[PDB]
Design an enzyme around this catalytic site. Structure first.
Site, PDB file in Angstrom:
ATOM      1  N   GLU A  44     -34.123  17.561  12.051  1.00  0.00           N
ATOM      2  CA  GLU A  44     -32.859  18.124  12.476  1.00  0.00           C
ATOM      3  C   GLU A  44     -32.615  19.371  11.504  1.00  0.00           C
ATOM      4  OE1 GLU A  44     -28.985  16.482  11.365  1.00  0.00           O
ATOM      5  OE2 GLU A  44     -28.348  16.431  13.339  1.00  0.00           O
ATOM      6  N   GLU A  84     -15.858  17.986  12.799  1.00  0.00           N
ATOM      7  CA  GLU A  84     -16.713  16.716  12.677  1.00  0.00           C
ATOM      8  C   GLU A  84     -17.477  16.560  11.536  1.00  0.00           C
ATOM      9  OE1 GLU A  84     -18.334  14.953  16.457  1.00  0.00           O
ATOM     10  OE2 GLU A  84     -16.498  15.904  17.511  1.00  0.00           O
ATOM     11  N   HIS A 141     -18.679  12.187  15.586  1.00  0.00           N
ATOM     12  CA  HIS A 141     -18.508  11.596  14.444  1.00  0.00           C
ATOM     13  C   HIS A 141     -16.871  11.157  14.005  1.00  0.00           C
ATOM     14  CE1 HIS A 141     -21.791  14.105  15.233  1.00  0.00           C
ATOM     15  NE2 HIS A 141     -22.553  13.523  14.331  1.00  0.00           N
ATOM     16  N   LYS A 168     -24.822   9.713  20.723  1.00  0.00           N
ATOM     17  CA  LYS A 168     -25.181   9.187  19.458  1.00  0.00           C
ATOM     18  C   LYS A 168     -23.612   9.435  18.741  1.00  0.00           C
ATOM     19  CE  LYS A 168     -25.591  12.355  16.083  1.00  0.00           C
ATOM     20  NZ  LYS A 168     -25.001  12.856  14.929  1.00  0.00           N
ATOM     21  N   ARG A 211     -28.239   1.531   9.229  1.00  0.00           N
ATOM     22  CA  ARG A 211     -29.403   2.400   9.296  1.00  0.00           C
ATOM     23  C   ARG A 211     -30.927   1.786   9.319  1.00  0.00           C
ATOM     24  NH1 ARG A 211     -27.153   7.641   8.547  1.00  0.00           N
ATOM     25  NH2 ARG A 211     -25.342   7.940   7.348  1.00  0.00           N
ATOM     26  N   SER A 230     -27.881  14.507   3.886  1.00  0.00           N
ATOM     27  CA  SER A 230     -26.959  15.403   4.947  1.00  0.00           C
ATOM     28  C   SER A 230     -25.636  14.539   5.231  1.00  0.00           C
ATOM     29  CB  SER A 230     -27.624  15.804   6.010  1.00  0.00           C
ATOM     30  OG  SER A 230     -28.084  14.915   6.975  1.00  0.00           O
TER      31      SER A 230
HETATM   32  C1  LIG Z   1     -25.944  12.802  13.878  1.00  0.00           C
HETATM   33  C2  LIG Z   1     -25.465  13.130  12.288  1.00  0.00           C
HETATM   34  O1  LIG Z   1     -24.124  13.606  12.451  1.00  0.00           O
HETATM   35  C3  LIG Z   1     -25.242  11.933  11.512  1.00  0.00           C
HETATM   36  C4  LIG Z   1     -25.135  12.009  10.222  1.00  0.00           C
HETATM   37  O2  LIG Z   1     -23.814  12.288   9.884  1.00  0.00           O
HETATM   38  C5  LIG Z   1     -25.415  10.657   9.449  1.00  0.00           C
HETATM   39  O3  LIG Z   1     -24.585  10.023   9.201  1.00  0.00           O
HETATM   40  O4  LIG Z   1     -26.643  10.566   9.363  1.00  0.00           O
HETATM   41  C6  LIG Z   1     -26.371  13.397   9.519  1.00  0.00           C
HETATM   42  C7  LIG Z   1     -25.973  14.528  10.517  1.00  0.00           C
HETATM   43  O5  LIG Z   1     -27.024  15.411   9.831  1.00  0.00           O
HETATM   44  C8  LIG Z   1     -26.378  14.344  11.740  1.00  0.00           C
HETATM   45  O6  LIG Z   1     -26.296  15.422  12.456  1.00  0.00           O
END
Ligand SMILES: *C[C@@]1(O)C[C@@](O)(C(=O)O)C[C@@H](O)[C@@H]1O
Ligand SMILES: *C[C@@]1(O)C[C@@](O)(C(=O)O)C[C@@H](O)[C@@H]1O
Ligand SMILES: [Cl-]
Ligand SMILES: [Cl-]
Ligand SMILES: [Cl-]
Ligand SMILES: [Cl-]
Ligand code: NA
Ligand code: NA
Ligand code: NA
Ligand code: NA
Lengths: 250, 250
Positions: A44, A84, A141, A168, A211, A230
């Protein structure tokens, strides 16, 4: 299943995504060279960390540098809005333009498109992606709280109705119950409502099990860290792979 | 917390239990010598695998062989009844006698006592254990199905009321939902009702995540395999430790 650049998303072990974050063209290159010495399934690019987002050309040049470094990787283009949890503000028009230009460049395999951008704009962008053989991770998010399982399931169902290739959702727990709620929504979605792969995660330390448990409860991918996370809760990518392999082969 | 032979059960990472299974005195010794070359926290002796259970002396001699091989290990004495998934039948009287003789031998640190043995006999055996500074893992197993979360919570609450030092329940999922139910009972127990450490597990392949997520949802210990599992779903002990460490340090 979504087979994207020769990766079958929705089969087998959850796929590992890592997020590349660079503020400028030089740092994007350096990060791409470092990331290609790690093992993961999907790259990503977190475009919202890039400072020179005002120039579509600059953004496209950065995408090209990544693609040049990793010619065969499934590449997901993600501008995470400040709304978000991303790094900076952007107008809706410029957000959609960056995505469309990424789509028609041929450089990317997928875009992230935030569900709450607006239905009409979502539909137009999904159609444009599909016309160019680009898949859409449609996303949502909540960096502050966890909605009810019912709300999350209806949100993911709406993403499917709007043509998401991969819905997602990432939510922030404020309790251990909140982590179970996210797992419950994931399982209900996967068993009763999904007709395509879905990605879910509960963020932060508390949510880490989400996760790891994608294979059991129905999350098709999960985020790991190469050096820096991230988002809160992401663990080192080698450790993530180790656990996923242990769960897969048990 | 239960600090048993210098192990603090209920703090930190879930404790790893392995089950020693030997049919005779010679095989018990060989297994003890092999087990002491693995890393784990608690040694369970599965007495019901021993053929010569008819002799209390023979059982005690086997316990002594184990203790001689591992002088410092927390040692849990477990006769699993056929009723609850063990290897052979035994009368209630002989079951209680084996446990009492294990208690007053000084060789063991804990006994397993099945909740459904009967309240009066449970009370007497718990009191005898405590009079000899032996802790009681009070246990229940359902090798065929998963009761409701409500039933499991009330079962664990009853174990506390009967003086269990560590309530324990192991159930068999028939669905992914059943695994979530077991996690839900674990969290509700730990947050709303527990006043001591509790052990929970969902068995089989499907339930494996329950053996990994003790730290988040409130199971104080988990079972791994040295070579052969003592119940379906147990994974290799080195792999178990690796995952527990990853979750602990995330
Ligand atoms: C999908 C996403 O928003 C989820 C993320 O926030 C996570 O919690 O791992 C990481 C982020 O880079 C990603 O875009
Ligand atoms: C506690 C216990 O019954 C649970 C077990 O069945 C498990 O599923 O790990 C193993 C068995 O040896 C143990 O006594
Ligand atoms: Cl590549
Ligand atoms: Cl369901
Ligand atoms: Cl020892
Ligand atoms: Cl609760
Ligand atoms: Na366009
Ligand atoms: Na639907
Ligand atoms: Na006695
Ligand atoms: Na109670």
């Amino acid at each position: 299943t979504v087979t994207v650049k020769n990766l079958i998303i929705g089969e087998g072990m959850p796929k590992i995504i890592v997020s590349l974050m660079g503020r400028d063209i030089n740092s994007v290159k350096a990060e791409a060279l470092a990331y290609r010495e790690a093992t993961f399934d999907i790259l990503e690019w977190r475009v919202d960390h890039f400072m020179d987002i005002a120039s579509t050309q600059s953004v496209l040049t950065a995408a090209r540098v990544i693609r040049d470094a990793m010619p065969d990787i499934p590449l997901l283009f993600t501008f995470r809005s400040a709304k978000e949890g991303g790094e900076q503000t952007i107008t809706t028009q410029h957000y959609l333009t960056l995505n469309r230009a990424a789509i028609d460049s041929g450089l990317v395999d997928m875009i992230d498109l935030e569900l709450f951008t607006g239905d009409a704009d979502v539909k137009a962008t999904v159609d444009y992606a599909h016309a160019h053989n680009v898949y859409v991770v449609m996303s949502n998010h909540d960096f502050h709280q966890t909605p009810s399982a019912e709300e999350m399931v209806l949100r993911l169902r709406k993403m499917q109705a709007l043509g998401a290739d991969i819905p997602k959702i990432a939510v922030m727990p404020q309790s251990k119950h909140d982590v179970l709620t996210l797992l419950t929504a994931t399982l209900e979605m996967q068993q009763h409502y999904a007709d395509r792969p879905v990605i879910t995660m509960s963020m932060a330390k508390e949510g880490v099990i989400s996760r790891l448990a994608g294979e059991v409860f129905g999350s098709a991918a999960t985020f790991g860290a190469v050096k820096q996370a991230s988002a809160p809760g992401q663990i080192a990518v080698n450790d993530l792979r180790s656990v996923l392999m242990i769960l897969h082969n048990a």
